Ligand binder design. Structure first.
Ligand SMILES: OC[C@H]1O[C@@H](O[C@@H]2[C@H](O)[C@H](O[C@@H]3[C@H](O)[C@H](O)O[C@H](CO)[C@H]3O)O[C@H](CO)[C@H]2O)[C@@H](O)[C@@H](O)[C@@H]1O
Ligand SMILES: OC[C@H]1O[C@@H](O[C@@H]2[C@H](O)[C@H](O[C@@H]3[C@H](O)[C@H](O)O[C@H](CO)[C@H]3O)O[C@H](CO)[C@H]2O)[C@@H](O)[C@@H](O)[C@@H]1O
Length: 373
């Protein structure tokens, strides 16, 4: 089947362009939605950094004029981009490999531009869209509504959220001297374009860890946590009725019943939720993966010392206390109504509300993606 895609600028003045980029269902061929409603399946270019040969910028009707409504074909790994004023320069690399705007890299053609995107996937099973602040918040927050079986709505960042986030993070940086302010991205004019999560600022330095921003943010805290659980159990409720597993630190290995082992994490690990003890590994049993998720989340939320049993029994009010925490997540959460701010933010105490920015429907009829308010 196909879904109807509605692109809408609710209030921003002037012209906003949307791009819809994805991997075609089955073929895996990068596809872009075109302004005319057709799909542009690029061929592999003759060189890297080959400008997208077709203009796939979809011009949005003016603020309030209603949506651009096209047919959304099924595609995965898909994005709806929005960009204000300008268009976005997409390139092609041999493959074809779409060169997506790199929100976090300053050399990027689009870096100085005001642009955002949300991720979605539309396959025969469901349209699954995701508002997510794991990586960045921008000056062009996206909201969505998915109409199918049910109506699902994800509230955007409110107007001005990215400025608030940038200011809070700069304030944080003033207090702790950590590079939170460097997560902020602004053009020559002064307006905040985006703020990126620490991992996106840290990954350029992954090859040179001794210069990585934030590298020692969590180091002291991690040592305190590892020391705590040398002498007392860490109980992680796997939830879903799977029960808790009790863990202890032996040397630098946090070991849970079931022999699930977690080496001592680094600030990098906590931020990426994907290195050190939080490195994904298909060999990991479900229990290990559940443990992994909850331990990463608990470190990000800085509840490892305060809550030897988690996530059940903790609440959001326990998160992000003290000087050393994932202030990106704290600040994003402060400044956003819904949506995750770090990779294991989906870890939530039972009975706490789902705060994912996800919208999914098994029979999507219209996927309204909007900027403005
Ligand atoms: O948000 C910034 C990050 O975007 C990343 O890209 C994501 C990612 O590629 C994602 O893949 C999903 C799953 O990992 C898996 O491939 O299956 C689902 C179903 O298709 C995928 O959606 O796809 C989204 C687009 O929906 C895409 O944005 C990376 O490029 C990161 O480098 C980047 O920080
Ligand atoms: O949030 C930023 C991060 O985006 C990530 O990718 C997400 C995610 O993987 C998601 O998967 C979907 C569901 O989990 C679902 O069960 O299955 C559907 C397919 O039917 C999946 O779509 O999908 C969203 C949107 O496609 C996707 O962005 C990561 O890839 C990270 O790299 C990134 O930081």
């Amino acid at each position: 089947a196909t879904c109807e895609l509605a692109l809408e600028n609710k209030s921003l003045p002037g012209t906003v362009h949307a791009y819809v980029t994805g991997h075609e269902q089955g073929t895996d061929r990068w596809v872009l939605l075109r302004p005319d409603g057709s799909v542009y399946r690029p061929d592999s270019p003759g060189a890297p950094q080959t400008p997208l040969p077709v203009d796939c910028a979809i011009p949005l009707k003016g603020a309030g004029a209603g949506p651009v409504v096209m047919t959304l074909p099924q595609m995965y790994g898909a994005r709806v981009y929005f960009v204000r004023d300008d268009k976005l320069d997409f390139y092609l690399n041999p493959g074809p490999s779409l060169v997506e705007p790199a929100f976090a890299t300053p050399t990027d053609p689009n870096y100085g531009r005001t642009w955002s995107f949300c991720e979605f996937t539309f396959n025969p099973q469901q349209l699954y869209a995701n508002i997510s602040y794991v990586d960045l918040v921008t000056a062009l927050p996206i909201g969505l509504t998915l109409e199918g079986d049910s109506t699902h709505t994800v509230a955007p960042l409110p107007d001005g959220a990215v400025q608030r986030i940038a200011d809070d993070l700069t304030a944080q940086a003033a207090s702790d001297g950590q590079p939170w302010d460097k997560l902020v991205t602004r053009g020559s004019d002064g307006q905040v374009l985006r703020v990126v999560s620490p991992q996106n600022l840290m990954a350029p330095f992954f090859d040179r860890p001794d210069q990585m921003p934030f590298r020692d943010l969590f180091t002291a805290q991690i040592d305190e946590v590892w020391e705590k659980y040398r002498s007392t159990d860490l109980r992680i409720d796997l939830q879903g009725g799977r029960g808790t597993l009790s863990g202890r630190v032996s040397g630098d290995t946090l070991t849970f019943e079931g022999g699930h082992t977690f080496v001592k994490p680094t600030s990098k690990d906590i931020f990426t939720c994907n290195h050190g003890p939080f490195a994904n590994d298909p060999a990991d049993s479900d229990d290990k993966k559940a443990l992994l998720a909850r331990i990463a989340a608990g470190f990000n939320r800085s509840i490892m010392l305060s809550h030897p049993q988690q996530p059940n029994g903790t609440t959001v009010a326990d998160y992000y206390k003290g000087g050393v925490t994932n202030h990106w997540s704290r600040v994003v959460h402060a400044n956003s109504p819904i949506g995750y701010a770090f990779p294991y933010d989906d870890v939530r105490p039972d009975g706490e509300p789902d705060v994912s920015g996800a919208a999914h429907d098994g029979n999507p009829r219209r996927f309204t993606v909007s900027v403005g308010s």
